[PDB]
């Protein structure tokens, strides 16, 4: 149908916008602490601590299969990255501090994206 194609043109454009948002968020992690999943070879107890791991590369695979239906879903995955890190690592670590910074710098980009998704559809 023609409705199905229009729905898909919108999913496609949401995906173009989220790819831009992803790049902006990742630029706020110059250290690359959140680029890849936590290694189970290197932290074999990790899944005892964190039930839903997340990282930028996993978000990117989902993004490119157009698996984000809306911005809420995307934001949930971004928050897992931050929130997982702040639980696993103690306050006085480079990892915890890197998450705090990504959250704060993330908040601006996400504030504007919610306006662009509301505005443009
Ligand atoms: Na903790």
Would you say 57 and 36 are in contact if contact means Cβ atoms under 8 Å apart? Answer: yes
Number of domains into which the chain is organized: 1
The approach used to solve this structure was X-ray
How remote is the CA of residue 2 from the centroid of ligand 1, in Å? Answer: 51
Structural domain including 105 reads 1-121
| Total Cβ atoms within 10 A of residue 49 | 12
Q: State the CATH number of the domain containing residue 22.
A: 1.20.920.10
How remote is the CA of residue 62 from the centroid of ligand 1, in Å? Answer: 28
For residue 86, count CB atoms less than 10 angstroms from its CB and return exposed for 0-12, middle for 13-18, buried for 19 or more: middle
How remote is the CA of residue 81 from the centroid of ligand 1, in Å? Answer: 14
How remote is the CA of residue 103 from the centroid of ligand 1, in Å? Answer: 17
In units of Å, what resolution does this entry have?
2.2
Would you say 101 and 28 are in contact if contact means Cβ atoms under 8 Å apart? Answer: yes
How remote is the CA of residue 89 from the centroid of ligand 1, in Å? Answer: 5
């Amino acid at each position: 149908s023609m409705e199905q194609v229009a729905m898909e043109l919108r999913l496609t454009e949401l995906t173009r916008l989220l790819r831009s948002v992803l790049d902006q968020l990742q630029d706020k992690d110059p250290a690359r602490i959140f680029a890849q999943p936590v290694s189970l070879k290197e932290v074999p107890d990790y899944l005892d601590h964190i039930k839903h791991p997340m990282d930028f590369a996993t978000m990117r695979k989902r993004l490119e299969a157009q698996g984000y239906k809306n911005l809420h879903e995307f934001e949930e995955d971004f928050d897992l990255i931050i929130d997982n890190c702040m639980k696993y690592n103690a306050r006085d670590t480079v990892f915890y501090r890197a998450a705090v910074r990504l959250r704060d710098q993330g908040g601006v980009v996400l504030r504007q994206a919610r306006r662009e998704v509301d505005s443009i559809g």
